[PDB]
Paper text:
Diagnostic testing and symptomatic treatment of myasthenia gravis are based on restoration of cholinergic transmission at the neuromuscular junction by means of peripherally-acting inhibitors of acetylcholinesterase (AChE), the enzyme responsible for the hydrolysis of the neurotransmitter acetylcholine at the synapse. Inhibition of acetylcholine breakdown renders the neurotransmitter more available for nicotinic AChR stimulation, which alleviates muscle weakness by improving neuromuscular transmission. Furthermore, the three-dimensional structures of complexes of several of these compounds with Torpedo californica AChE (TcAChE) were also solved, in order to shed light on their mechanism of action.
While the conjugated system of the molecule is sandwiched between Trp84 and Phe330, making a π-stacking interaction with Trp84, the orientation of the chlorine atom is quite unusual. In the TcAChE/5 complex, the chlorine atom faces the opposite side of the gorge, pointing towards the main-chain of residues 116–118. In this orientation, the nitrogen of the exocyclic amino group H-bonds to the carbonyl of catalytic His440 (2.73 Å), and the methyl group points towards the entrance of the gorge. We decided, therefore, to model a second, minor, orientation in the active site of TcAChE. Other large electron density blobs in the mFo-DFc maps indicated the presence of a second copy of 5 at the PAS. 5 was modeled, making a π–π stacking with Trp279, but in two alternate conformations, with the Cl atom pointing either into or out of the gorge.
Author numbering:
A (entry chain B): 4 to 534
B (entry chain A): 4 to 535
The structure:
C-alpha cells in the first residue's frame, strides 16, 4: 500500500527501512531508462519500456562500469567512493526515500553523484538518503548516469555516439521524476537538483541547457560548476580522444561508423583499461571523457551563455571546501603521501605546478609560480605543499565556481554562497589534506546523526544545521527560516558578495571569497595564455 | 701656504672656512676641463689648459645649464635642488674640502650629483663637503658634469656629438683627482666615488666602463644603479631624440653635421625649453638625454657586461630609501598633491600605472596592477597611493639596484647593502611621501650635526654613524671598524643576501631586500614583455 506504487511504466514495491528510532520507505533500483547495452552503447538513452508485474525495489541496483580505485586496498577513505554493487552497463536506475507516512506533495531533492564524470555510484553509504528524507521530511531521489567513455564518448556529427549521453541519462531521470514523483508524495513543481564535484558541474549544466531547465525548480552546487576546466571539452578534443581510444584498441579509424562499431564490440573493462591514455597531457584533476560543448545540449559556449543570461533564472545555493586540491595531489603529484606530512621540496613544487595547469605555456607556469611562492621562504616544505594545494583547488574548483557565482547572480533570483572549512573529528586522511573535496557530503546526508560513526555532538549539530539549510532552501528558495532567531545566511549580491563559513562555530559572514587568487585565475592568466 | 696649492695645470688659492667650532680648507671652483662652449658644445671634454698666476678658488663656480624646477616657487623642499649659482655652459669645475692641518695622504671621496642626468649642481647646500671632510678626516671632492642635451645628446657615429660626454666630464674630473689630489693631502690610490640617483647610476657606469676603472678604488651607490630603466638609451633611441630636438627647433635634419651646426647656434635655454618634448611616452621617471649604450664607453650591453663579469672588481656599498617613488608621483601623476594626503582613486591608480611603466603593453600593465592591488579593498585611497609609490620606487630604483647587487656580488670583492627608512623630523614634504628619494643625502653629508637646522639628537647620531660607515668603507673597503663592540654590518653574499636598516634604532640585519616584488620586476615582467 504505502510500499506499492503504480508508476507510469509499471508497479514498484519498496521496502520499509529503519532510520534512527523510526522508519521510512525506500524504493531502490527503479529503472528509468532502457539498458544502454549492445548497439545502444554510446547512444542517447531511451525511456524504460513499461513492465508487467511488480518491480522489486527493495535492493540497490548495479553501478555503472567505471575505473575502480585500487591505490589503497582496503582503506576506507578511498574504498568509500568505489562501487559497492556489481558493475554493469545495465545501470540506469534511481532510488527514492519517502517519509512515512507518505506526504501529500512535499519538496523533492534529487542527488547527482560526482566522480570526475569517470566514476561514481548512487549507492554509496555516504549517499544513503534516509537521514535527510526522514529528518527534513523531503522526498530524496538519487539518480545514476553513465560515466567514462560509456557516458561521454563524443564523435560530433554521429548520432550513434553524439556525446553528452550521461547528461541525457541525468535528464531522463529528471523527466521520470517530473512524470512520476507525485505517486510517491513529491511535488514535481518543487524539485531541487543537487550534486557535488562533477555532480555540481552537472547541476550547473542543467541550469544552462534549455532541454533541462523545466525539469527542476532550483539548484545546489557543491564544489563544482559547469565552467570548471576539467568539466568539458570542445568537439574537436572530444573527437581526438575518441579516435585515440580506438587507436589504443587497434580499432578501424577510417570512419565514425567503423570506430564506433569496433568500440561497441569491446568488453567494458577493455575500454576502462585504456581510458586514461587519451588525455593530452600528464595532469592531475583532468578526466578523459567529459561533457562536450556540442551546439545542442549547450547551444553556445558556456561563457557566452553566462554572459547573455541564457540559462534558467532561479535560486541557487552553492559553495566550496577549504582544501579542494589535496586529494588530487595525493594521487598525482610527487612528494605527497597519505602516511607523511608531505612537505614539498622546491623541485617537487615546480613539478606539481606543471601537472596542475597542464595547458599552460612556460610564461603561464612562471605566473602561477610567482603568484603562489613566498620568495622570502621558498624552501619551506609546508608552504610549498599548501601552495600547491591552493593552486589545485583554486584553479579547478574555487575560482571557476566564483566566476559562475558572479555571472549567475547578475540574472538569477537569489544566490547563497558557503565556504565549508570544518575538518571532521574522525577523518581517516592525514592532517595535511585539511578539508577534503567531498567531505562535506557526509554532513549534507546526516551521517553525524548516527552514534556508531563517532562524530562529536557539535558535528551532529552542524549536520542538522546543514541538512536544514539545504532542505529549507529546496522548499522555499531561502536556506533561512524567517521569523526565526537563528543567525541569517545573507544573499550573495553582485555588490557585497557575501558568503558564510560552514563549520561548528557561530556563523561568520565574509565578502569576496578568495577574490585575490580568483582575479588571477579568471582574468589575468587567461589573458596571458591567450597572448 | 696651506691654502696655496700648485697643481699640474697651475696655482690655486683656497679659503679657510668655519666648520662646527673649528676650521677646514676649501678649494672651490677649480677648473678641470676647457669650457665646453661654442663649437665645443656636445663635444668630448678637453683637459684644462694650464694657467699662469693664482686661480682664485674661494667661491663656488657656475652651475651647468639645466631645466629649473618652478613647481613650488620659494618652497625649500624643491628649491634646495635647484641651481644656487648662475647657470653657464662654462661649468666644468670641482670643489675640494681638505682637513686642517693638511693630512699626508688620506682617503679621498668624490661626490657625483644626481638629477636624472638633466639637472644637478655640485654647489647645493646639501652637498657641502665640510662636515664630512672635517668629521671623518677625508679629502672630499665634488665634481660637475654637463647635463641634459649639453651632456648627453647622442648622434652615434659623429665625433662632434658622440653621446656620453657628461660621463666623460666625470671621468676627466676623476683623472684630475688621480693626477692632482696628492697636492691636497689625498691618496690617489684610495679614491671612493659616491653619488645618489643619476650620480649612483654614474658611479655604476664607471664601474662598468674600462676607461674609468683605474681612476678610483671603490664605490658607493645611493638609490641608483647603471641598469636603471631611466638611466640609458640605445644608440637608435638617442639618435631619434637628438633628431626630434632639432625638429622642435626647426633645424636642418639632413645630416649629423647640419643638425649639430644648427643646435650649436641656439641659446642654451632654447634647447632646455623643448628638451622634454623628445620623450617617446607620457611618463614619469623618464629623462630625455641620458647615457647611450655606444660600444665605446660601454663596450657591450650592460646586462652582458654584468653577466660576464666585465667590470671593475672591488668593494661596493649601496642601498635605497623606503619611498623612492613619491617625489616623482607628486610631480607627474594624477591625484597627488603636496598639500593633501593624496588618496588615489582607482581611476587615477590605473592612470599612474600607465605613466609609471610607459613601455608596457596592456598585458604588462594588467600584471603590474594585479601585483600591487588588494582586491579585497581596491577603493582604499591610501592603499592605492602607497601601491603606486611602491610601483615607481620598485621599478625605477629598488629592483634595478637589487639586480645589480646580485650580479656584481658574483664577481666583486665585497658588497654592503643598506635600506634607509628614517623620515627626518624636520622634513618639509608631507607625511604621505615618506622616506623620500634623496633625503638620505643630508645624513651622508652631516647636516644633522648643524644645530641651527633642528635635527634631533638621534638624527645627529644617525648622521655620524652613516658618515663613519661611508668614510670607513672608503678607507678600508669595510664600513665596520675593527675591534669595535658595535653591531657589525654584514657582507651581502649571494646565498644569505643580508642588508641592514639605516635609521635611529639599533641596527637590524635582514635578508632578501624587496625580494617578492623584484622577482616580478627583474624576471617575470621582462619575460612577459619579451614574449608579448
Ligand atoms: C574518489 N574520491 C576520493 C576522495 C574524495 N574526497 C572524493 C570526493 C568526491 C568524489 Cl566524487 C570522489 C572522491 C578522497 C580520496 C579517495 C578518493
Ligand atoms: C590510472 N590513471 C589515473 C589518473 C591519471 N591521471 C592517469 C594518467 C595516465 C594513465 Cl596511463 C593512467 C592514469 C588519475 C587518477 C586516476 C587514475
Ligand atoms: C599511471 N598513473 C598516472 C597517474 C596517476 N595518478 C595514477 C593513479 C593510479 C594508477 Cl593505478 C596509475 C596512475 C598520474 C599521471 C601519471 C600516470
Ligand atoms: C629635484 N629633486 C627633488 C626632490 C628630491 N627628493 C630629489 C632627490 C634627488 C635629486 Cl638628484 C633631485 C631631487 C624632492 C622634490 C623636489 C625635487
Ligand atoms: C616639464 N616637463 C615636461 C614633460 C615631462 N614629462 C616632465 C617630466 C618631469 C618634469 Cl620635472 C618636467 C616635465 C613632458 C612634456 C613637456 C614638459
Ligand atoms: C609630467 N609633466 C610635468 C610637468 C609638466 N609641465 C608637464 C607638461 C606636459 C606633460 Cl605631458 C607632462 C608634464 C611639470 C613638472 C612635473 C611633471
Ligand atoms: C557485442 C555487440 O554489441 N555487437 C554489436 C554488433 O553485432 C553490431 O553489428 C554493431 C553495430 O553497431 O553493434 C555492436 O554493439
Ligand atoms: C524482493 O527482494 C527482497 C530482497 O531479496 C526479498 O526479501 C523479497 O522477498 C522480494 N519480494 C518478492 C520476491 O516479492
Ligand atoms: C526574485 O523574483 C521576484 C519576482 O520577480 C522578485 O520580486 C524578487 O525581488 C527576486 N529576488 C531576488 C533575490 O532577485
Ligand atoms: C567509537 O568510540 C568508542 C570509544 O569512544 C570506541 O569504543 C568505538 O570503537 C568507536 N567506534 C568505531 C567504529 O571505531
Ligand atoms: C677671490 O674672490 C673673492 C670674492 O670674489 C675676493 O674677496 C678675494 O679677494 C679674491 N682673491 C684675490 C683677488 O686674490
Ligand atoms: C677579496 O679578495 C681577497 C684577495 O683575493 C680575498 O682573500 C677575499 O676573500 C676577498 N673578499 C671578498 C669579500 O670577496
Ligand atoms: C630651528 O629651531 C630654532 C629654535 O626654536 C628656531 O629659532 C629656528 O627658527 C628653527 N629653524 C627653522 C629653519 O625652522
Ligand atoms: Cl553554531
Ligand atoms: Cl649660444
Ligand atoms: Cl658571495
Amino acid at each position: 500500500s504505502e510500499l506499492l506504487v503504480n508508476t507510469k511504466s509499471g508497479k514498484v514495491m519498496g521496502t520499509r527501512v529503519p532510520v534512527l528510532s523510526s522508519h521510512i520507505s525506500a524504493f531502490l533500483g527503479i529503472p528509468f531508462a532502457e539498458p544502454p547495452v549492445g548497439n545502444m552503447r554510446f547512444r542517447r538513452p531511451e525511456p524504460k519500456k513499461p513492465w508487467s508485474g511488480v518491480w522489486n525495489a527493495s535492493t540497490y541496483p548495479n553501478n555503472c562500469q567505471q575505473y575502480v580505485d585500487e591505490q589503497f586496498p582496503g582503506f576506507s577513505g578511498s574504498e568509500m567512493w568505489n562501487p559497492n554493487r556489481e558493475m554493469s552497463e545495465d545501470c540506469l536506475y534511481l532510488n527514492i526515500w519517502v517519509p512515512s507516512p507518505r506526504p501529500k506533495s512535499t519538496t523533492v531533492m534529487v542527488w547527482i553523484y560526482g566522480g570526475g564524470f569517470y566514476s561514481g555510484s548512487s549507492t554509496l553509504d555516504v549517499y544513503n538518503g534516509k537521514y535527510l528524507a526522514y529528518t527534513e521530511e523531503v522526498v530524496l531521489v538519487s539518480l545514476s548516469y553513465r560515466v567514462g567513455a560509456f557516458g561521454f564518448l563524443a564523435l560530433h556529427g554521429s548520432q550513434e555516439a553524439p556525446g553528452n549521453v550521461g547528461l541525457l541519462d541525468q535528464r531522463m531521470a529528471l523527466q521520470w521524476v517530473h512524470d512520476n514523483i507525485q505517486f510517491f508524495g513529491g511535488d514535481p513543481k518543487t524539485v531541487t537538483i543537487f550534486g557535488e564535484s562533477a555532480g555540481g558541474a552537472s547541476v550547473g549544466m542543467h541550469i544552462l541547457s534549455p532541454g533541462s531547465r523545466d525539469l527542476f525548480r532550483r539548484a545546489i552546487l557543491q564544489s563544482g560548476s559547469p565552467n570548471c576546466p576539467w568539466a568539458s571539452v570542445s568537439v574537436a578534443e572530444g573527437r581526438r580522444r575518441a579516435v585515440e581510444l580506438g587507436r589504443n584498441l587497434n580499432c578501424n579509424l577510417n570512419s565514425d561508423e567503423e570506430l564506433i562499431h569496433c568500440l561497441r564490440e569491446k568488453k567494458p573493462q577493455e575500454l576502462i583499461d585504456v581510458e586514461w591514455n587519451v588525455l593530452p597531457f600528464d595532469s592531475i584533476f583532468r578526466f578523459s571523457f567529459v561533457p562536450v560543448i556540442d551546439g545542442e545540449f549547450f547551444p553556445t559556449s558556456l561563457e557566452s551563455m553566462l554572459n547573455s543570461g541564457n540559462f534558467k533564472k532561479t535560486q541557487i545555493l552553492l559553495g566550496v571546501n577549504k582544501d579542494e586540491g589535496s586529494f588530487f595531489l595525493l594521487y598525482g603529484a610527487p612528494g605527497f603521501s597519505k602516511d607523511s606530512e608531505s612537505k614539498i621540496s622546491r623541485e617537487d613544487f615546480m613539478s606539481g605546478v606543471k601537472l596542475s595547469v597542464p595547458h599552460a605555456n612556460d610564461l603561464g607556469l612562471d605566473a602561477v609560480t610567482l603568484q603562489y611562492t613566498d620568495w622570502m621562504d621558498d624552501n619551506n616544505g609546508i608552504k610549498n605543499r599548501d601552495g600547491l594545494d591552493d593552486i589545485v583547488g583554486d584553479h579547478n574548483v574555487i575560482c571557476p565556481l566564483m566566476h559562475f557565482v558572479n555571472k549567475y547572480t547578475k540574472f538569477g533570483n537569489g544566490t547563497y554562497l558557503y565556504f565549508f572549512n570544518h575538518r571532521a573529528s574522525n577523518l581517516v586522511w592525514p592532517e595535511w589534506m585539511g578539508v577534503i573535496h567531498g567531505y562535506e557530503i557526509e554532513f549534507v546526508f546526516g551521517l553525524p546523526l548516527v552514534k556508531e560513526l563517532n562524530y562529536t555532538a557539535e558535528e551532529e549539530a552542524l549536520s542538522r544545521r546543514i541538512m536544514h539549510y539545504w532542505a529549507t532552501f529546496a522548499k522555499t528558495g531561502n536556506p533561512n527560516e524567517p521569523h526565526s532567531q537563528e543567525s541569517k545566511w545573507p544573499l550573495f549580491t553582485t555588490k557585497e558578495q557575501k558568503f558564510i563559513d560552514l563549520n561548528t562555530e557561530p556563523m561568520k559572514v565574509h565578502q569576496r571569497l578568495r577574490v585575490q587568487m580568483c582575479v588571477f585565475w579568471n582574468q589575468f592568466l587567461p589573458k596571458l595564455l591567450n597572448a
